[PDB]
Design an enzyme around this catalytic site. Structure first.
Site, PDB file in Angstrom:
ATOM      1  CG  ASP A  35      -1.920   1.237   1.541  1.00  0.00           C
ATOM      2  OD1 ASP A  35      -1.987   1.767   0.142  1.00  0.00           O
ATOM      3  OD2 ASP A  35      -1.895   1.444   2.523  1.00  0.00           O
ATOM      4  CB  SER A 199      -1.651  14.245 -13.895  1.00  0.00           C
ATOM      5  OG  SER A 199      -2.589  13.477 -15.153  1.00  0.00           O
TER       6      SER A 199
HETATM    7  C1  LIG Z   1     -12.509   9.517   3.016  1.00  0.00           C
HETATM    8  C2  LIG Z   1     -11.091  10.827   3.147  1.00  0.00           C
HETATM    9  C3  LIG Z   1     -10.159  11.131   3.675  1.00  0.00           C
HETATM   10  N1  LIG Z   1      -8.888  10.692   3.297  1.00  0.00           N
HETATM   11  C4  LIG Z   1      -8.641   9.747   4.496  1.00  0.00           C
HETATM   12  C5  LIG Z   1      -8.704   9.911   2.050  1.00  0.00           C
HETATM   13  C6  LIG Z   1      -7.560   9.093   1.858  1.00  0.00           C
HETATM   14  N2  LIG Z   1      -7.274   7.005   2.357  1.00  0.00           N
HETATM   15  C7  LIG Z   1      -5.953   6.762   1.511  1.00  0.00           C
HETATM   16  C8  LIG Z   1      -6.385   5.445   2.001  1.00  0.00           C
HETATM   17  O1  LIG Z   1      -6.708   4.820   3.288  1.00  0.00           O
HETATM   18  C9  LIG Z   1      -6.694   4.739   1.089  1.00  0.00           C
HETATM   19  C10 LIG Z   1      -5.931   3.892   0.988  1.00  0.00           C
HETATM   20  N3  LIG Z   1      -4.359   3.206   1.006  1.00  0.00           N
HETATM   21  C11 LIG Z   1      -3.692   4.141   1.819  1.00  0.00           C
HETATM   22  C12 LIG Z   1      -4.429   5.757   2.395  1.00  0.00           C
HETATM   23  C13 LIG Z   1      -5.024   8.289   1.300  1.00  0.00           C
HETATM   24  S1  LIG Z   1      -6.051   9.603   1.291  1.00  0.00           S
END
Ligand SMILES: C#CCN(C)Cc1nc(C2(O)CCNCC2)cs1
Length: 330
Positions: A35, A199
């Site tokens: 991940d 991007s």
């Molecule tokens: C909803 C909302 C706000 N953030 C938590 C959204 C996000 N979730 C992530 C992760 O957990 C997604 C899965 N891989 C690891 C990172 C990064 S930013």
């Protein structure tokens, strides 16, 4: 040193990918979800609440002669889907595809949320974002990549995810036979702990390219491609019958449709996601409505280049003193 391990989709939809990881002495092999959006290596274990384990392989530190309790260290993490886990911490020897790190923090789950219990194929996560996101308290711990960096031939790892097929994670070297053309490298911001980049724009199908900056994160731990609502609407408007469904939770489209490709910019270069990669199949068995692989990021606060995007590319996570990301077609 280097390492190389095959990563395999857990199901016919490429919902996630698992990579075998050796932990402890003698080795205990667990299949972990690598991940790049998080920074904890955590595993189902002999300490996980019994009613929360359903078919996973568990790490048993008491059977490892190299395991050591990291006294007083605990961890607790939440992911974008609302899932969570927590527990105690050991250090142990961890090997991936021949690359060995001694004294790696291995976070043993005492509790996991329901989505982890329900996925019998994923024995834990191996985080590859920056160590500033690691949740171990009171002494924050380094990721497997961070610990391995000094020993690696080159301070890099690469993700080469397959489409409905296995792929490869390599550590410490760039396999120049694994991609076509050249690798375009682009700047990374570590300010939020992610492999965060910009991007240069997008195109839908055979359409012209729209130059526009799209900040987002390269996250092998997210299945789909989450982009701004404007971009996502422009994509799905090309698919007859596609619409955003509040009940389903995103864009759906008729399963009878053939989808257009989606191109994203990396500097002056272009990565083309074939339309079939955007098809995530019926919303429920037998349904003629299918779930789209490109979804709006509007509710999450950040754009995510998840597996849908990354599996169209050979991706270099360059952990040099100034980190960068590289993308090549393949
Ligand atoms: C909803 C909302 C706000 N953030 C938590 C959204 C996000 N979730 C992530 C992760 O957990 C997604 C899965 N891989 C690891 C990172 C990064 S930013």
């Amino acid at each position: 040193s280097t390492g190389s391990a095959t990563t395999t989709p857990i199901d016919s939809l490429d919902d996630a990918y698992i990579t075998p990881v050796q932990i402890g002495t003698p080795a205990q092999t667990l299949n972990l979800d690598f991940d790049t959006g998080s920074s904890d290596l955590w595993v189902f274990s002999s300490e996980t609440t019994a009613s929360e384990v359903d078919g996973q392989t568990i790490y048993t530190p008491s059977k490892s002669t190299t395991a050591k309790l990291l006294s007083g260290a605990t961890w607790s993490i939440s992911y974008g889907d609302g899932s969570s886990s927590s527990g105690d911490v050991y250090t142990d020897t961890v090997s991936v595809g021949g690359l060995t790190v001694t004294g790696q923090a291995v976070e043993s789950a005492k509790k996991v949320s329901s989505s982890f219990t329900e996925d019998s194929t994923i024995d834990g996560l191996l985080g590859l974002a920056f160590s500033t996101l690691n949740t171990v308290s009171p002494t924050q711990q380094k990721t497997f990549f961070d610990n391995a960096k000094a020993s690696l031939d080159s301070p890099v790892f690469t993700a080469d995810l397959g489409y409905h097929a296995p792929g490869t994670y390599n550590f410490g070297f760039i396999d120049t036979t694994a991609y076509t053309g050249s690798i375009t490298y682009t700047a990374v911001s570590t300010k939020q702990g992610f492999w965060e980049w910009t991007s240069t724009g997008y195109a839908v199908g055979s359409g012209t390219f729209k130059s526009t900056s799209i900040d987002g994160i390269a996250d092998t731990g997210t299945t789909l491609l989450y982009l701004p609502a404007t971009v996502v609407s422009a994509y799905w408007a090309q698919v007859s019958g596609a619409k955003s469904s509040s009940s389903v939770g995103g864009y759906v489209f008729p399963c009878s449709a053939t989808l257009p490709s989606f191109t994203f910019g990396v500097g002056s270069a272009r990565i083309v996601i074939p339309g079939d990669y955007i098809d995530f199949g019926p919303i429920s068995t037998g349904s003629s409505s299918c779930f789209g692989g490109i979804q709006s990021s509007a509710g999450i606060g950040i754009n995510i280049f998840g597996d849908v995007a990354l599996k169209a590319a050979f991706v270099v996570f360059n952990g040099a003193t100034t980190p960068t990301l590289g993308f090549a077609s393949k």
